[PDB]
Amino acid sequence: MPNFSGNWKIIRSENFEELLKVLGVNVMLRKIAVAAASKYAVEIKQEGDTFYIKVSTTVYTTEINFKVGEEFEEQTVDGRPCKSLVKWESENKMVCEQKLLKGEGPKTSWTKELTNDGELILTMTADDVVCTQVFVRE
Numbered sequence: 300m301p302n303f304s305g306n307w308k309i310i311r312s313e314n315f316e317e318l319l320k321v322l323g324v325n326v327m328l329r330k331i332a333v334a335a336a337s338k339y340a341v342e343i344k345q346e347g348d349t350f351y352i353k354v355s356t357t358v359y360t361t362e363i364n365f366k367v368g369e370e371f372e373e374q375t376v377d378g379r380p381c382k383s384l385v386k387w388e389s390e391n392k393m394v395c396e397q398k399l400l401k402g403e404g405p406k407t408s409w410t411k412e413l414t415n416d417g418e419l420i421l422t423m424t425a426d427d428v429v430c431t432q433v434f435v436r437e
């Protein structure tokens with residue numbers, strides 16, 4: 300029974316650098332971030348409403364655990380602790396609204412969707428800007 304469960308590898312990444320600009324990241328780091336983003340792998344274990352997600356590059360890995368509908372702490376795309384909450388939008392799309400623990404900055408959110416043709420699509424939004432990363436089953 301195919302759901303979000305599996306090992307995914309990035310095949311495209313539109314607007315990553317623009318998003319990091321909105322998050323105040325300096326040019327050079329933006330450019331390295333982009334280079335490193337072509338090696339993004341994602342591992343998802345899913346049972347019902349409940350998700351384990353590991354995202355790794357060449358040199359960094361992180362894990363989140365969440366239940367749909369339950370608040371949890373994570374990091375934004377610019378690595379600040381935030382409050383996060385995930386809701387379904389349809390059978391195989393979910394959206395996440397984030398609010399900052401401490402401090403001021405852009406409105407962030409993200410979405411994961413499992414298309415009919417077997418891709419995983421990730422959007423990440425900072426204010427006006429929308430990054431789109433497409434993944435395929437490893």
Ligand SMILES: *C/C(=C/c1ccc2cc(C#C)ccc2c1)C(=O)OC
Nearest residue numbers: 339341352354375376377409421423
């Ligand atoms: C599930 C997930 C994956 C993902 C992909 C790319 C990311 C880039 C950065 C940066 C900088 C942070 C987190 C990423 C996470 C996700 O939910 O991301 C928000």
